[PDB]
Design an enzyme around this catalytic site. Sequence first.
Site, PDB file in Angstrom:
ATOM      1  CG  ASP A  40      -2.031   1.055   1.168  1.00  0.00           C
ATOM      2  OD1 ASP A  40      -1.559   2.184   1.304  1.00  0.00           O
ATOM      3  OD2 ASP A  40      -3.267   0.820   1.084  1.00  0.00           O
ATOM      4  CD  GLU A  84      -3.784   4.880  -1.022  1.00  0.00           C
ATOM      5  OE1 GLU A  84      -4.589   5.748  -1.458  1.00  0.00           O
ATOM      6  OE2 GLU A  84      -3.105   5.018   0.003  1.00  0.00           O
TER       7      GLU A  84
END
Length: 168
Positions: A40, A84
């Site tokens: 992430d 993301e």
Amino acid sequence: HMNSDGLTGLSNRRHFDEYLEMEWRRSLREQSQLSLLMIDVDYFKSYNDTFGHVAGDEALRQVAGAIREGCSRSSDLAARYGGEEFAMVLPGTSPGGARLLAEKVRRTVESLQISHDQPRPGSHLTVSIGVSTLVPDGDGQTFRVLIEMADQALYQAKNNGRNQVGLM
């Protein structure tokens, strides 16, 4: 199939899910190890907000390229899991191998030297990564345990200061 994310070039989430399940079924039959990375991008909201969506998308594209370099065996798969969030499935990879691959991905991202002002002025865009490894138990749908374990490790990495690999 047409199973990639356009921006990043990686597998899409649907393909990821299908592939992980298939590798879980195989690994359950074989009682073989299966490793997973959950990745992430750190401080991405602030990046996108400060620099705009064109810059944010191009950053994601460069991060995705760094992640793709982590794949080298035919059975490895890298995906865009969400906005993301990325994932990598590593069949037959043992925990030390998975850890070092995660460090490779993380350091490759940092070596992009994409300037950011978070967590402080003069920083670079980074990722946090969680790593899990299991010999499967249960049935085909138990594969979500491997995701949960990697997400736990990722949660640990984020809370412990980001730009790091979390294990277990």
